[model samples]
Target: DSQEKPKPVPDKENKKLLCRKCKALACYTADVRVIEECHYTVLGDAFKECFVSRPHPKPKQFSSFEKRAKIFCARQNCSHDWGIHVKYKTFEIPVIKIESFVVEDIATGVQTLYSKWKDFHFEKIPFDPAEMSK
Candidate 1:
C-alpha cells in the first residue's frame, strides 16, 4: 500500500554539493562558504542555499556525498527559498541547535545576550527595574 524510500550510504571524502541555483559549493569551497540561507516560509522553502547531509542514491554504490533534495526553489522566491529533499527510510530530524548573535550598538545598550530565557525570567521579579531604568 505504501512505498517507502530507499537507504544508501553517502561518501564524504570527495563528495561536495553544489547549489545549482546558487551555483556555489553547498559546503566548503576555496576556504569560503558562499552564504548561509534562511527559510522563513513554507517548510519546503526552508532549505534554500543550505547544505544538509543525505544518503546517496542507489545504483551508484560509490561512497560519495549525495544530495537528496525534495525541495527546490518555488516560482515566487525561487531565488531565495528552496525546498527540502532528503532520502532515507527513517528520518532523523535535524533541529536548530544553537544560534549566535552579536549586537554592537555602542550608541545604545544590550552588549550581549547570554540567554533569552534569562531575560524573560528576570522580568518575573517582584519589581524588575530593567524596564523602568530604560
Candidate 2:
C-alpha cells in the first residue's frame, strides 16, 4: 500500500500568485521572471520529479546551474504582504532551496517566516499571457 500516485495538475489555464493565508489572487505569473544562475550545485535531485514533469535538458557543455523564481503578494488593501523566493535546476525539479518565504503586515511592518513550503503551502498558479488583455 506504499505506491505513490501523481499529484493532480490544478486548472489548465488562468494562473495567478496568491496570498499564502488569504488565498487571494495576489500577483500574475506573467510579471515574474525566472533567474538562472550557473554556479550553484544541484541538490534535491530526488524531489525534482515531484514538481517538474519534463525531463531536464542536457547541456551542450556541462556546468553547474540553477533557476530561481521570486513571487510576492501584490494585492492592494490586502494586509498580508509576503514574498516567496525559490531555487531549482529546472521546472522538472522540486524547489531545491527556498531562500526566503515571509509574510509581512502592512500596518505593523512585522514579518512572519517559515522554513518549509509545506508549512506555508503556496499554490502554483499557471500563467497565461493571452488572457491579460481581456
Candidate 3:
C-alpha cells in the first residue's frame, strides 16, 4: 500500500536568504538596506559580510537622494554578480514586489535570472516606510 505524503505549507517567515552556489546563509533581514526608490521601483542592497567564508566591511553610508545606488551581492565571492531587485506601487499602503532575482555561474559566467520570486524561492525582505518615501 502507498502512504500519503503531507503537503507543505507556504511560510514566508520561514524563507531564508542563501547563496546559490555554496548554499550558505546570505544575509538576515537586518542586513538588507533600502538604498533608494524610483517611480515604482524601490532599490535595495545586500552584501556578503554574513558569509563565514569571506567577511567584508559593512555597507558604506549612503544618501537616499543619490542618483546611482550600489547593488551588493548575497553570495560569498560572487562580487556584484547577483542579487534581488524590487518593484512596488503605493495605494493606501505601499505594496512591494520582487522585480527579479539574478545569479551568475562562476565557471560559465552565464547568469540565471528569474522574473518572479517564487521561481527561485528566495526570501522577500521587509519594507521600511521611511526608506520607501522620498
Candidate 4:
C-alpha cells in the first residue's frame, strides 16, 4: 500500500528573517515578530465543517474562498503582515564553520593560530557526566 497524503498546513520551515528595524539577519523565531497571515488555520472545525465539508454552506455574496476567508495579522506592535498567498522560493544555503584559533596574550596583545583539532587535547576532562547524573 502507498503512504497516506499529508494534510496541507502553513508550514514554518525554520523561518529566518532580517529584523525590519535593524536589518540584521536573525536566526531564531524569538528574534522577530511572527505575523499570522490567515484565520483559516484557527477557525474551529464547527465553523469550517460548513465549508470544508459541504464545500460551501452558504456561498452567497462572496463565493470565492479568498473573500469569505479573511487574512489578518497576529503580531501585536505591527502586523508586518505579508498576506497568505505568496509562493515562496527556496534556495539551499549550507552552514559552514571557519576553523581557527585566535588567542590573545593579555600581556603583549599577541595572537596565535591553531586550526587543527589535534592541536587541542581533552584526554583529561575535569568532570564526569556519570558522576554528575547521580
Best prediction by TM-score: 3
- Which lDDT tens digits does candidate 4 get at residues 16-101? 22223233221222211211321112112221221121123433343222322222222242334222221112211111111212
TM-score winner, 2 or 4: 2
- Candidate 3 lDDT, tens digit per residue, 1-134? 66765323223333233444454444332333232422222223223233212224544434323212234443446553333222234312212233333243333334443555455333344456664345
Off by over 4 Å in 2: 1-101, 130-134
Q: List the lowest-lDDT window of 10 residues for candidate 1.
A: 33-42
Worst 10 residues of 3 by lDDT: 86-95
lDDT of model number 3:
0.35
Q: Could you tell me the lDDT of residue 31 within candidate 2?
A: 30
Report clashes for each candidate as comma-separated counts: 11, 3, 0, 0
TM-score of each model, paired residue for residue: 0.20, 0.25, 0.29, 0.18
Clashes of 2: 3
Q: Pick the candidate with the highest lDDT.
A: 3
Say which prediction, candidate 1 or candidate 2, comes out ahead on lDDT: 2
Q: Which stretches of candidate 4 lie over 4 Å from their true place?
A: 1-100, 121-123, 128-134
Query: Candidate 4: global Cα-lDDT?
Result: 0.25
